[PDB]
Paper text:
Type II topoisomerase DNA gyrase is essential in bacteria and absent in humans; along with homologous topoisomerase IV (Topo IV) it is a major antibiotic focus, being the target of the widely used fluoroquinolones (FQs), the last class of broad-spectrum antibiotics to have been introduced into general clinical practice. DNA gyrase is a heart-shaped heterotetrameric (A2B2) enzyme containing two GyrA and two GyrB monomers. It negatively supercoils (underwinds) bacterial DNA by creating a temporary double-strand break in the bound DNA segment (G or gate segment) through which it guides the adjacent (T or transported) segment of the same DNA, consuming ATP in the process. During the catalytic cycle, a GyrB-coordinated magnesium ion is required to cleave a phosphodiester bond in each DNA strand, with DNA 5′ ends temporarily attached to the catalytic tyrosine residues of GyrA (Tyr122 in E. coli).
Taking account of these data, we synthesized two further compounds Albi-2 and Albi-3 where we replaced residue MCA1 of albicidin by decorated quinoline or naphthalene moieties with known ability to intercalate in DNA as flat aromatic molecules. With Albi-2 we additionally explored electrostatic interactions with GyrA Asp82 by replacing the methoxy group of pMBA5 with an aminoethyl. Albi-3 was found to be highly bactericidal (MIC for E. coli, <0.016 µg ml−1), whilst Albi-2 showed severely diminished activity compared with both Albi-3 and albicidin in MIC assays (4 µg ml−1, that is, 60-fold increase in MIC for E. coli compared with the parent compound). However, Albi-2 had ~4-fold better activity in the gyrase inhibition assay than Albi-3, indicating that the aminoethyl moiety compromises cell entry. Therefore, to better understand the effects of different structural variations of albicidin, we selected Albi-2 rather than Albi-3 to determine its conformation in the gyrase–DNA complex (Gyr–Mu217–Albi-2) at 3.25 Å resolution. The binding of Albi-2 displayed a degree of heterogeneity, but in contrast to Albi-1, the vast majority of particles fell into a single class corresponding to the occupied TG site (that is, similar to parent albicidin). It seemed that the size of the N-terminal segment indeed controlled the positioning of the compound, with the larger N-terminal residues of albicidin and Albi-2 preventing intercalation into the smaller AA pocket. The amino group introduced in residue 5 of Albi-2 was not found to interact with Asp82 of GyrA, but instead rotated away towards the hydroxy group of residue 5. The probable reason for the lower activity is the exclusion of the amine from the hydrophobic pocket.
Author numbering:
A (entry chain A), B (entry chain C): 8 to 524
C (entry chain D), D (entry chain B): 405 to 806
The structure:
Amino acid sequence: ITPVNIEEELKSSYLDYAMSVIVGRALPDVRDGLKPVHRRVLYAMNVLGNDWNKAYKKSARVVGDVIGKYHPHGDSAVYDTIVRMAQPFSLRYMLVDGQGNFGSIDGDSAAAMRYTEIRLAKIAHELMADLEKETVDFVDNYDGTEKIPDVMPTKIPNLLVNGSSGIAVGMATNIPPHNLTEVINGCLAYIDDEDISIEGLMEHIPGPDFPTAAIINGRRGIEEAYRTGRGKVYIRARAEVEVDAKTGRETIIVHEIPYQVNKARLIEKIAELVKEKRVEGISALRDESDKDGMRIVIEVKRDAVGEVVLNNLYSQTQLQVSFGINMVALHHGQPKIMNLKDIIAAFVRHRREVVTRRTIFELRKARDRAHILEALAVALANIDPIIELIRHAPTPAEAKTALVANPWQLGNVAAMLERAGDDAARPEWLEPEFGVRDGLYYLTEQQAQAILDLRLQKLTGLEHEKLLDEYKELLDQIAELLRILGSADRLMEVIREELELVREQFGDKRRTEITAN
Amino acid sequence: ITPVNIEEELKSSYLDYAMSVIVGRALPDVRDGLKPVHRRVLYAMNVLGNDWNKAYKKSARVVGDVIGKYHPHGDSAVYDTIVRMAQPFSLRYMLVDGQGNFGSIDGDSAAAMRYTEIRLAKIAHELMADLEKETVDFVDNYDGTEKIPDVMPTKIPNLLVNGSSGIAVGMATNIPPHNLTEVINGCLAYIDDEDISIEGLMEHIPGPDFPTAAIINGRRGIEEAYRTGRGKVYIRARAEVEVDAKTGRETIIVHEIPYQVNKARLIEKIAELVKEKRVEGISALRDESDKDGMRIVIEVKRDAVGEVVLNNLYSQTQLQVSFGINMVALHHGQPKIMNLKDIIAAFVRHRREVVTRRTIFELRKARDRAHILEALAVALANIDPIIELIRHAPTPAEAKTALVANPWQLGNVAAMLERAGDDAARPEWLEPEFGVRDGLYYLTEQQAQAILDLRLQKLTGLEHEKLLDEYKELLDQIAELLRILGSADRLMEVIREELELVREQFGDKRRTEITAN
Amino acid sequence: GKLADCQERDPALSELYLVEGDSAGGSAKQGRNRKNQAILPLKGKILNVEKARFDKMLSSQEVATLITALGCGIGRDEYNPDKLRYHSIIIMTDADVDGSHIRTLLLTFFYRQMPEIVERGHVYIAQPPLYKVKKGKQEQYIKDDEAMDQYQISIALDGATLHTNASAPALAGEALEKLVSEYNATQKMINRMERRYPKAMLKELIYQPTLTEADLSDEQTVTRWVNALVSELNDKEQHGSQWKFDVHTNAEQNLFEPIVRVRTHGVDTDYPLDHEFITGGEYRRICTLGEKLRGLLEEDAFIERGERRQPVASFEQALDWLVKESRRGLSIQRYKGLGEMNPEQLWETTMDPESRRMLRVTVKDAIAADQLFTTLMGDAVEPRRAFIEENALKAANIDIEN
Amino acid sequence: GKLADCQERDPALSELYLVEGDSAGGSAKQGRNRKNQAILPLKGKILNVEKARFDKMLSSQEVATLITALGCGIGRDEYNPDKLRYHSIIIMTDADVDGSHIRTLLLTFFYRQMPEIVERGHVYIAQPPLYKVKKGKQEQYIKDDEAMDQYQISIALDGATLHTNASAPALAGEALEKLVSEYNATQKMINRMERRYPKAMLKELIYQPTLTEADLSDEQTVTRWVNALVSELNDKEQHGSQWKFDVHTNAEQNLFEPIVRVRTHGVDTDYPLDHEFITGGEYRRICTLGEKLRGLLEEDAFIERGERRQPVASFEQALDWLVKESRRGLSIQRYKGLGEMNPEQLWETTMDPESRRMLRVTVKDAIAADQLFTTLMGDAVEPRRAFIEENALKAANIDIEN
DNA sequence: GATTTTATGCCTGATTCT
DNA sequence: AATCACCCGCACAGATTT
DNA sequence: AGAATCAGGCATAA
DNA sequence: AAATCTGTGCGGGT
Ligand SMILES: COc1c(NC(=O)c2ccc(NC(=O)c3ccc(NC(=O)[C@H](Cc4c[nH]nn4)NC(=O)c4ccc(NC(=O)c5ccc6cc(O)ccc6c5)cc4)cn3)c(OCCN)c2O)ccc(C(=O)O)c1O
Ligand SMILES: [Mg+2]
Ligand SMILES: [Mg+2]
């Protein structure tokens, strides 16, 4: 037993909890726009080989694997997180391909884990491109037994296109979706001119683009949010009034509703309002949405005008909603309020880093393969002494020592070996003692082992020529990679080509209409 | 709207359900005594590599794999089936080694699937012995994607050893456990003499042997059950009366209880019976069973007699129970009532079939390997012409055609082939055109391909000697397999050796005591 | 309480569905016509009223809820079929054996407790599908296995498949389809008589020439015939079994029988082709099919699949190659239960009035139905066991095979 | 209400526990002392009485059950602390952030509703362990990561570890342990300041000598030090890094502006070093440790490990090899929560009166505690945000350098 | 993380009719 | 087989008091 | 006094 | 008749 003051315990415990929640659960990362749970789920699904053109898997398998291996928390939260990513009316670009009962726009329910199936989406493979080439770092899991990526090498601007929403201790974040083509055009414009202002970006990006295709009523909140990071906009439904003549009847047909609205709640709220006589001029209400589109029919009395009741509905019910834009994200593990240009710059810097690391890895691999092929080509030109030496040796180890002991003359293959640009295709870790010396070749241990593994099939002419062709191809590839690493302009060309390819592949059309008051 | 008669619908539906339950759910197979769910669980656990000398795995993973791949049914039934096989007080010889909380004899219940782990037991590997050598038939699963064994190539008499219990439509089955050494001795006695009567068998198999080590009362029922296949026996608990002089007051100590009896329910029933003055002379009741063993203490009144109350306890309480032996099993896909001799004969015939198929497979493999070894030796005998011919080869196919369409000189290896004459090692599928004809070897296409896939590493002396040693031992293996297939007594000798080895490995002592009335 | 009522109040245009399982009921409630359709999920198996007492029937929860939902009376002096709600009733259970058992229990309840409901024709049975097949653009549902076989056969012979014998003939559809259908029928006939003969023996006879029992008599050609048969059997044997033949002339027509030693290490006594086998029509149809299946293929032959080609040398190989090519861009989904179906599929398959398919239950004979119910669902074990044994595999030995 | 009341009716020797979760509650009920202990499991997070109105406190089930179990009244003109039961109260929550949050909620409830109970010192806090170490025979429990690190270091240097530098010296225990402890302290000091400088520069500067500002000059002396540092950094690279340097003068001192580039086309353009850094105590202690840490190893050197000897340079890898040797026969388990522990472990580790460990809660000042509670647990967001920002990592970057 | 009563057949004990 | 009752922050109708 | 009828227990499935 | 006050729901956690 030892006394402790209440203030110190309260302070330490609450600060620890707040710091854990701020950077552990809620806020996303600016570079890839994913919370930790999303990253862990995607990595777990990728490790299983659950590709987009293969058979489905049960959700229970993936949820259990994620809980056991990487994410030690409850199963209901993980399953809800998986279910939200497969709904067409929640994400602009879905990241999971689902099968079963995943719910509907009425917000009814979703089937349990043991009644549904899932797999990765085609676009999701762009988020995890070139993951095996040491493009990012890895960190230990909760008990120092596994490795998880620190950040995905994303190729899509995920944060802007898919948006974000999160609640933390002391702060909150809320960012709407966007369109992919406009964002890519803005990124290309930024790359073309690095001192671009907000207006130049907004020429390509008028505003958000929700999945449900509502109407945005206003043009000032978008500018304020994109300039300072905080703003407010109004989303309005789509409706019209039609007259069929005859007896001068008027009916209101509702087609499209705002974002994040449950249709059944709206219908029952309107029914309750007309029951209490709070809205005058409404006779009948019906829903007739069936497999083709959304339609809600409202029949009004003959002693009223449709426009007045429509405006009353817009003012009263949930047909018009207010959306508060508030952009908060982690920059370097610290929350920060940002605007459009900061996000674009962060994405561009991430792409530069990823491409540089990929180039270094590829250069190393090419140099190693060229080093092996040099020894193979040298050995193939001195078959008779090599086979004589191997036959006379009693053991493979003695044969290897005898091969390594003395130098070997280059022979007729000295033309291409000396045509290389000195140290263009020379591995760095290799000592200067080995390699092509003055008129003679010195073999290493692994080169001798590779020679001893050669098959009799390679003595044919075509197999002899293929090695030389591959050697020349590798020399060309090494030259290209060195040229890319040389200047700072080729990197932007590569990035622009990749962005244009992504735009051509995954582009789409606009849904939401922006209009003045 | 096609009408349908009620009678035909009822008849077809009920007949389909009854046949499926009879031949797919409840009754076991006589050859191995496993219901389909047990076989599927064991096969699924074996395919995953969950051996008896490796790390544990969680129950949920195995249950999910079983449900997804082979068994299209619920999870509770599968988990209960797995749990019952890991309880020392349910099976005489456990088949699953479990870690966690799998219940207790007092009446507790096992933990959920998420909190326990399992793996295979050592004895289970005897059931699946020689499964990879084409010994049993495979059948399609429910979706026609995977293969499941039709029956395990068992080596343990599982049916008699572990018993069985099942309820079907129109019939039921109930068979008690037995001791392994007695059953093996009975099988050996039957092998020695196939005309042995039931009297001869019963000298080696006195009676059942329960896990809990109760007492069996009477002897007529056992003989009747083993002669006709239906009978009844009485299982009595072990108890005694102890007095420590001094006060001269006795107490009843109970150490053991019958098979399938709950301790808590027994204690509370005894308390309820003695509360209502239904049993006289009982003063106090206590339980002190913990760690060391089982002990239940009953303190009788001072003026009572221990023997009278002890006899009344058997009549009234559950310290004595009645077990009805009723043997029903599937013989050839149909229910049938068995006795001891039929079970023993079926097991012996199954063993004979399995050994014959295994021998055939081994002989085929040995001949196939010896063919390629002869080809490689003949090729190495003439290395210089082979490489000289290959060097002038535009492509591999031309080299192969050149090698195939020409005789070759045996050289110094022919002496070894003198031991291989008489068509001992030639494959049956091989035509008479190929092979040695007049002291000059003839090569086939596959032999030429094997020659072309030869490494330089095997040009040393030791690698040459290894092939000769391998060929020499393969000739002896082929001779032994042919001699095994050539007679019937050798098969019985092999079977007897296997049975004796199993008895030595897994034998143990008796628990239950059989006594007359 | 586990009952989604319909807004329609006239008791002559409503319906009632008895779904199996809770998830299935949840899926069905979303995809239904809310005006005049009601749902009543069942959690699991239900009480058997044939064996139970009336007091326990009243005590149980599922049957009490069903009785309250129907609205009619229960027991004598209370039952009144006139005051009936939901004048249409549909079962719609799963497509496996457990579904059949629950269906039989529900039929027993309806017939024993409410005879007039069944007699007047207010009970129906639904037919949900099993397979869903998509081939890029087309999509369709297939019930059970036989329709899947027909679909596979149609897809295999769908366009191209112009078999070339010597230079470039063209069977062109109908002849090939008839030959394939006859071959499949013969294979189905052969597969159901595995107990009485080996499969390989029956398969081998089709390609060999006809025995011609009419002109055989005692020409001693049976020796060459059986020797050739045994040699052909042993030529391509790949399982270690061996075959021998025995012949005798006990009658004017010489008889023969084979003896086969198989992997079990025991030799069967014989499989004699007695007068019954040669005189049976099975051998006649086998010979008739073999007449069309002689060595029609030439030295060089191939199959002309669409924008593809591959040489072939046997009818079976050609069929296998065609079937393998037919399964290139085909996607098949198998429904393990009603819980695997989203509401749109259930609506368009089983609940749409203008595209659903059902069966109407009716009673033909009263005494026969009563005897059948008493025998099967009664609490006397021995009559049920005898009935199951009578209709067992011993009565499955149908000698027609057509 | 999930309360397993004790038998001791005298309220001067009883105990009460507030377990988190259901599995932990069941384990505690299994492993408790039945005489004078009670268990009251809590299923999940409870109401925050600081924000909620007084009406909803009575409506809430959890706090209502807790108030009933305690036995004291609630609200003014009804509270009576004399009529108390369970004079000892223990929290015993998990050892993660959610457990700390639940602990804070319970403390807020107790302090706001029952000041006298907290003042008199009847509320205690338990302390279960985190790690369990097993070494064949020696097995035990270790709490917190710092104790685990201390245990690992002690086991690494548990006898032997005679550092043979040149011919045969011997630190022999205390000197080596002191040096290792100082090195670990400097490593922690480097890690906490890792954000503002690279790791490699700090790790390499310790081996370099002092700056030697006394003989510093505008030319021929300032360049040599930075050039030597850059040379010693460049020749140890594995990630394609490059180090460059430049110097400048401001009429008082010659300041360094080193730069480094790795996997980026950009450049920081400055990592300045001037009089401010050298005047700091961090560099002073770094140089103090580096004075002992020099190239003391001769051509021959090794460590006389237990039946082992590894003559090599780069003493960091020698320490790694020592750690590997220590961990050869060591097994570690990391508890995920109270549910993992079986009843015997819970009994012997936290609930045993003679081997448990706890903490007593007391109040030092009243106004300060009240202000802290109002600031943190109130419903004013801006003060809470300001408080969290002030005590954020910026205030944690303590420049005491000691 | 924990949540209901049913079918199918052979033994028993406790209880109810003539 | 989906449902239980609380924490965290921001914006908004209808309900109470000055 | 002795037939007759009613329940609970065991192991794989909704 | 201006100004405080009381509830509901969005998305990851016990
Ligand atoms: C059968 O399925 C299959 C599979 N199967 C699988 O592949 C499968 C594989 C794996 C696992 N699992 C696991 O290995 C595991 C491992 C570890 C755990 N964790 C723990 O032990 C720890 C302990 C612990 C720590 N500290 N204290 N205790 N639990 C917890 O920390 C923990 C977390 C949360 C909670 N409560 C809540 O949140 C909660 C909520 C509401 C509340 C409401 C209230 O009002 C109040 C309170 C509420 C609280 C409490 C404690 C858990 N599981 C698995 O299980 C289910 C995965 N979902 C699998 O199914 C596959 C295929 C098929 C097929 O058909 O092909 C298939 O059918
Ligand atoms: Mg089913
Ligand atoms: Mg926790």
